[PDB]
């Protein structure tokens, strides 16, 4: 506990001392292009583009969304999306590389424009550790 550091009761930490919740909301939308060339929220596979993320797409459902129960981890794909070009290109949203957690709430709404609007909250419990500030 020398030079502005401190000793914490691990026993208390277990008991719930200073534990917190952490939520982060990843968001995306289906961008429309002039000639009705809209995007697609789907779970894509190889099928020409090959230009897609490495994270397990296998956590996604047919709507290109993870169900709100699943424990997500690496750059696991949280939102599946495709962009058409004059063909499946990938516009998927992976979990922030470093971060890990559980899918909390998935919001499937509409943009003012009348477009597919998606918001994915991902929750984790952050327990007091050795470099944590107080």
């Amino acid at each position: 506990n020398q030079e502005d550091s401190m000793i914490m009761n691990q026993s208390s930490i277990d008991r719930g001392l200073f534990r917190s919740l952490f939520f982060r909301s990843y968001m995306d939308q289906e961008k429309k292009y002039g000639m009705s060339i809209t995007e697609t929220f789907e779970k894509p596979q190889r099928t020409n583009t090959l230009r897609m993320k490495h994270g397990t797409y296998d956590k996604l459902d047919d709507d290109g969304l993870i169900a709100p129960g699943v424990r997500v981890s690496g750059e696991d794909v949280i939102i599946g999306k495709t962009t058409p070009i004059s063909s499946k290109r990938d516009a998927s949203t992976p979990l922030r590389s470093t971060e890990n957690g559980i899918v909390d709430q998935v919001l499937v709404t509409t943009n003012q424009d009348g477009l597919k609007f998606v918001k994915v909250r991902v929750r984790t419990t952050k327990i007091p550790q050795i470099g944590d500030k107080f």
């Binding site: 009761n9 026993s11 208390s12 008991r15 719930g16 001392l17």
Partner: protein
């Protein structure tokens, strides 16, 4: 936000004692210092657990789904 089971410092169960505490104050009218003591909360670590709790759960319950 919802009564802590077990006092962080010593680990004596504190989970059962919430409603009982809240009651020793409304119905029995007693002061906080005597209520805790009735409930057998001797050490201040245990006392602070209940005495400083903020049962936010109730406010959360006020929303629908």
């Amino acid at each position: 936000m919802i009564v802590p089971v077990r006092c962080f410092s010593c680990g004596k169960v504190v989970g059962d004692k919430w409603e009982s505490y809240l009651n020793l104050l409304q119905e029995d009218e007693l002061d906080e210092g005597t209520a805790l003591s009735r409930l057998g909360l001797k050490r201040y670590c245990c006392r602070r657990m209940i005495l400083t709790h903020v049962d936010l759960i109730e406010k959360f319950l006020r929303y629908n789904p």
